[PDB]
Design a protein around this ligand. Structure first.
Ligand SMILES: O=C(Nc1ccccc1)Nc1ccc(C(=O)N[C@@H]2c3cccc(O)c3C[C@@H]2C(=O)O)cc1
Length: 167
């Protein structure tokens, strides 16, 4: 039993809710919140900018030290950093950014990072300003992630479409 409320169950392990991931993180304080990161961990917009803002820029400060030590992530890769005031941990996952021409097949590799964590609060990878089709992203999520994932979808119109079109 966990503390996530109001989710629709899509499969054995995938749940979805129309919610602001920042507000959901602030209320649940999950073990892991997933960030829609880029390889530089520059949290300027989209989910990343919102999560970083909610940490009063502490996420960005920690991220800049991580990059200075380790260099950029790979597209499809991830790193575990602090969750600050939002979660125990933040899993920064780099989905491909279609608006940069990155290979959409890397989306499956990106979702594979979720399997290293038993339970996660997460956005749809590569959705929003990353330019992928969120319906495709949801399909890859369901077909790749085997651990328990609670997806927060900010846009109500998109949430309903995602639900209504889900196979
Ligand atoms: O800024 C906050 N919250 C907040 C921050 C500071 C203080 C208080 C509250 N939230 C927030 C901001 C942006 C996003 C976001 O870009 N969504 C994306 C979106 C939008 C439309 C269609 C989409 O396919 C997607 C993908 C992504 C998502 O829905 O996952 C999501 C959440």
């Amino acid at each position: 039993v966990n503390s996530f409320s109001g989710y629709l169950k899509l499969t054995d392990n995938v749940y979805i809710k129309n919610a602001d991931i920042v507000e959901e993180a602030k209320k649940v304080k999950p073990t892991v919140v997933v960030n829609a990161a880029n390889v530089y961990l520059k949290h300027g917009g989209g989910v990343a900018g919102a999560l970083n803002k909610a940490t009063n820029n502490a996420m960005q400060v920690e991220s800049d030290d991580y990059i200075a030590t380790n260099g950029p992530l790979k597209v499809g890769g991830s790193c575990v950093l602090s969750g600050h005031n939002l979660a125990k941990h933040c899993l920064h996952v780099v989905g491909p950014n279609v608006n940069k021409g990155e290979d959409i097949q890397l989306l499956k590799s990106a979702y594979e990072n979720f399997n290293q964590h038993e339970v996660l609060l997460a956005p749809l990878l590569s959705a929003g300003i990353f330019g992928a089709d969120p319906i495709h992203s949801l399909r890859v999520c369901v077909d790749t992630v085997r651990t328990n994932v609670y997806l927060a979808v900010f846009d109500k119109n998109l949430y309903d479409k995602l639900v209504s079109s889900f196979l």
